[PDB]
Symmetry: D2
Subunit: 268 residues, 4 copies
């Protein structure tokens, strides 16, 4: 086919070629889809990275803490894909949390401004991002954001866990909004993946103990995952997303798909 053939999808979240958003972006192109991209803080420095990709993309500035960039989103996206033209997808592949809310830093010593910043970026934005892009989105289309399963507590994810719990809650509201448009809204709970927002994360060897709470993460997840799990390889999470963007899951919304190797279904 080109499983995303002719489809016109925006893809947020890139900042290196180890970014998952990069990998969704790649696969979506391998597969048919004229793209539009967003980046946060040097674009300059990103365009170099989005170049590294098969086909090419209008790449627009977007800082999701900016009321001013969101108000315009819809504007700019129509410039760049043409007029009388709407989007068929959207990828929220964005997140962030102060070092304070994460790693060995005690849980109680994060002050709320720090956490607020996390939630806003990792949580709220899925909803701004849908408020801005649904008006220019077609029937039978799709939004996807990237989750990491927060049902259970764990060490190191600390307050990011709490943001991800809020993400899932948001996601199902946004589905209720999106469905007035014929749009689906779903997350992809992914298994762990080698991106430098991880070697931030616990990170940075804030440890030497942290060659460890990363090796043992990769062993952990591979052991539990009935089909095994490769932390060096985003393409299984990226193919799973293109699936949601696809029409082949036309009756799932409000929902969370786990591309984690079925590790979450096993206790050990």
């Amino acid at each position: 086919t080109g499983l995303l053939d002719g489809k016109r999808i925006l893809v947020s979240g890139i900042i290196t070629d180890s970014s998952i958003a990069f990998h969704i972006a790649r696969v979506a192109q391998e597969q048919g889809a004229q793209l539009v991209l967003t980046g946060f803080d040097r674009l300059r420095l990103i365009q170099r990275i989005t170049d590294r990709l098969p086909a090419k993309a209008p790449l627009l500035e977007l800082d999701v803490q900016n009321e001013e960039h969101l108000a315009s989103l819809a504007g700019r996206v129509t410039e760049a894909i043409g007029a009388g033209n709407k989007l068929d997808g959207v990828v929220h592949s964005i997140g962030f949390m102060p070092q304070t809310g994460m790693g060995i830093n005690p849980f109680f010593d994060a002050p709320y401004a720090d956490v607020s910043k996390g939630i806003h970026i990792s949580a709220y934005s899925y909803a701004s991002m849908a408020k801005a892009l649904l008006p220019i989105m077609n029937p039978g289309g799709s939004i996807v954001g990237m989750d990491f399963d927060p049902s259970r507590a764990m060490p190191a994810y600390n307050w990011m866990t709490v943001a991800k719990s809020a993400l899932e809650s948001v996601n199902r509201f946004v589905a209720r909004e999106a469905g007035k448009y014929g749009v689906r809204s779903n997350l992809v709970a992914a298994g762990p993946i080698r991106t430098l927002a991880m070697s931030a994360i616990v990170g940075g060897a804030l440890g030497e103990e942290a060659g460890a709470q990363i090796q043992l993460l990769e062993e952990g997840w591979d052991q539990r995952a009935p089909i095994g799990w490769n932390m060096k390889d985003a393409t299984p999470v990226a193919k799973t997303v293109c699936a949601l963007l696809s029409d082949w899951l036309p009756a799932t919304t409000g929902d969370i798909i786990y591309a984690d190797g079925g590790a979450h279904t096993q206790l050990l």
Copy 2:
């Protein structure tokens, strides 16, 4: 081209032109997949029904309560798709619970021996069928079974619920077995679909009030469903089965996918 070009796939459970398996076989085929089919005791019935599929495909007896068929089955399947050629997909769309287990019939009056039969056919069969079909499956291959969200109580479903709770659990284990061969196990939790048997209960064959309980229950999927649910269109669900059978969710096994238009994620 799209989804299944090349893939050989068993598909259980055809009994009517309206059976969920049938709409699975159809879509499988229109997506370039060559099949073997199974069916249970009304066999030349099944051949008339399966003649209305796009491609012909062979068809084999298979009552999952009988070991001489289970034993014999990889034998017969190999035989109808050619020696040293193996199966990339398998679909159990099978299920049964004596009427004693269901509707208006009091919950406490189902004899264990009716309940043991429904659990045999609806839940244990998924394993016994995996046991037998895994020797002729192929890496990156896919088994998918049919589910109804058993995770909470409801009118009518009664002890089919309890079987579906058993299946969700069998499936995790089956994944734990199937990963040995590079094979995913997964269920698809569908919304209600107006099969024949359901056109009959809506039409009053269980009584002029039994049919109302089922109707308010039934009817509130669409009301809950962010993108609606139409129970007289099985296509979204068959489309969902193909997604699992495809290479496009390779990091999910052990799990359940909700093809219920989103409703299981909303309260009202």
Copy 3:
């Protein structure tokens, strides 16, 4: 004798004679527990309200958005229950979300800065309150907070839902912290209770159709509830909080207990 003979217990959140905390303080007391109480900015209001409790008990200002109260609080609590005497129980019955976050107000139009306030007060406060009160707690002691089942979408609750999703997650971590001191953390997921603010929304202060949405939603707890649910009787819920504060669930922490008459376990 029964439940709490001997136990010293803080209990947040009294604002009305109908507040869920109040019916908690009452039952705590009738069960032989000596208390300290907190409240927020309508302070001599709180003293008239708390005069109708069986025993007197002291009362302290505590707005959880302010650090000089949080800092100061174990100071003040120690002071009102006597030096080298510590707390066996703690109750957060606190919660707020601007009206922009709720009812008929469109989901996408709540400004992050309203959402960050509701999450501050409803969810982050549970940690910041544990941080401060754990130094003066005692082994086998108990913290319990108030929840509403946020695990799926619904009309009205909107972004309070998203906060409650955050709380369920904070609570797991707080347990992970509190176990350091032989202290359980747990939430109680209540059914709806006709507090004052809710007698007002049922009575139409959000509009002659906003009040209907809430009524069909509200009303179907009792219909779902295997043992009924009466929202103008907060006693079962206060009774439930005491169970947690008691020695009689010592192997449960991190968790949520559903005091909703069973309804969250049934579909219809």
Copy 4:
């Protein structure tokens, strides 16, 4: 009090003084409650064990695979507690599975008769047990059975996992039945406990590998459990049950309480 004061509760499942049912039985007596007991296969040999207990008990034969013993249950129980006298509780502390369905024995090599036997005993019976005893049970009373969390697959629990998934499904039906009587019905998902149906289980050193998948179980669960977990000590699971029998959780049914040290809420 005697938190179960004056209360009249039947307690099934004893066969040694390491049985959990033994421990619930003890604590319920420590606490006020005239008991009635059931045992399975030498009673003879059990009465010696139920003697070991504080106060004393009518101890009745009950093999839950016997249509004949259930038909009589209600009869015998009224002989033994007097007439114009009903029960206020019931403890399903019973289970069983063929060696075949458990341990290193492959999952696929259990034949269905074996599993049927498991489900019947571990699953169905909660429901026969409520069908027989609700007719002689009072308003505001309670039934409890013992769960071990089956949401995730794991090794060794094999088909017992599947029975426990069916138990939870059953439990919420039985609650729907029980509530016509004012009766609650709930499970207690317990953490692991040293009982000789465990050193059956994997068991019997069917291993030497099995000093191990038991030490590592005890280490596992203690590590994850924010308040720590002692596998040599049933009393925390037993106090949790008496709690359900109590009136202090008067608004929970259909439900599952976890007395596992909050290990299930943590991933690690």
